[PDB]
Curated annotation (Swiss-Prot):
The modification N6-succinyllysine is found at residue 7. Keywords: Hydrolase, Magnesium, Manganese, Metal-binding, Peroxisome, RNA-binding. Mg(2+) binds at residues 79, 83. Belongs to the Nudix hydrolase family. PCD1 subfamily. It catalyses: hexanoyl-CoA + H2O = hexanoyl-4'-phosphopantetheine + adenosine 3',5'-bisphosphate + 2 H(+); octanoyl-CoA + H2O = S-octanoyl-4'-phosphopantetheine + adenosine 3',5'-bisphosphate + 2 H(+); butanoyl-CoA + H2O = S-butanoyl-4'-phosphopantetheine + adenosine 3',5'-bisphosphate + 2 H(+); decanoyl-CoA + H2O = decanoyl-4'-phosphopantetheine + adenosine 3',5'-bisphosphate + 2 H(+). Fatty acyl-coenzyme A (CoA) diphosphatase that hydrolyzes fatty acyl-CoA to yield acyl-4'-phosphopantetheine and adenosine 3',5'-bisphosphate. Cleaves CoA, CoA esters and oxidized CoA with similar efficiencies. Preferentially hydrolyzes medium-chain acyl-CoAs and bile acid-CoAs. Has no activity toward NDP-sugars, CDP-alcohols, (deoxy)nucleoside 5'-triphosphates, nucleoside 5'-di or monophosphates, diadenosine polyphosphates, NAD, NADH, NADP, NADPH or thymidine-5'-monophospho-p-nitrophenyl ester. It comes from Homo sapiens. The record marks 53 as: Important for coenzyme A binding. Residues 24-149 form the Nudix hydrolase domain. It is found in: Peroxisome. This is Peroxisomal coenzyme A diphosphatase NUDT7.
Length: 186
């Protein structure tokens, strides 16, 4: 099926705990996959205007590891719960993708998780201004604007609201789309 085929594909790019012990400042992100109307979607947040780093920007749920976390996946789940209400029984963590190195001293580890069909986002307004879905297929033929560097513009046909997606967030979305959608019979 669609979901089982997505997980089998994702498991082949799983690096595991390989890079997890290295002595970095550590952050984790969740890439949440949602099935709606026969198709896979990614869930995104718009950061609150009040935040210190990157107010008003599109990003995945995530943040900094703390001493309670058993592992890097636990960081991602804890942060997703606190930002958009996502509970642990509502997410299956499928795999750990290649981490991102930033600023010489920081490592960001992304996890892909399948989200239960009955989940509804309760955004925390102190951290999250907005939550939205994008069809996974969009990342194969995006609408690109050059800022000189590449920015994606997505218009939700439900309400005509346009979002800008860029940087690490845009790169990870394209990656996940390639992994799951490349080479499929129609
Ligand atoms: C996981 O949080 C981050 C995300 C990004 C980003 O590029 O989206 C940049 C960061 O630092 C420069 C972050 O914290 C270190």
């Amino acid at each position: 099926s669609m979901l089982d085929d997505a997980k089998a594909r994702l498991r082949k790019y799983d690096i595991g705990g390989k890079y997890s012990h290295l002595p970095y400042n550590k952050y984790s992100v969740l890439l949440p996959l949602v099935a709606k109307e026969g198709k896979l979607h990614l869930l995104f947040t718009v950061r609150s205007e009040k935040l210190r780093r990157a107010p008003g920007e599109v990003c995945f749920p995530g943040g900094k590891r703390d001493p309670t976390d058993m592992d890097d996946a636990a960081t991602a789940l804890r942060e997703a719960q606190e930002e958009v209400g996502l509970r642990p029984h509502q997410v299956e963590v499928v795999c750990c993708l290649v981490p991102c190195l930033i600023d010489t001293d920081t490592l960001i580890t992304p996890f892909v998780g399948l989200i239960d069909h009955n989940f509804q986002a309760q955004p925390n307004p102190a951290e999250v201004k907005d939550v939205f879905l994008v069809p996974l297929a969009y990342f194969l033929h995006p609408q690109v604007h050059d800022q000189i560097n590449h920015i994606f513009e997505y218009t939700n046909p439900e309400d005509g609201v346009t979002y800008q997606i860029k940087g690490m967030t845009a790169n990870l979305a394209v990656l996940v789309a390639f992994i799951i959608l490349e080479k499929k019979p129609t």
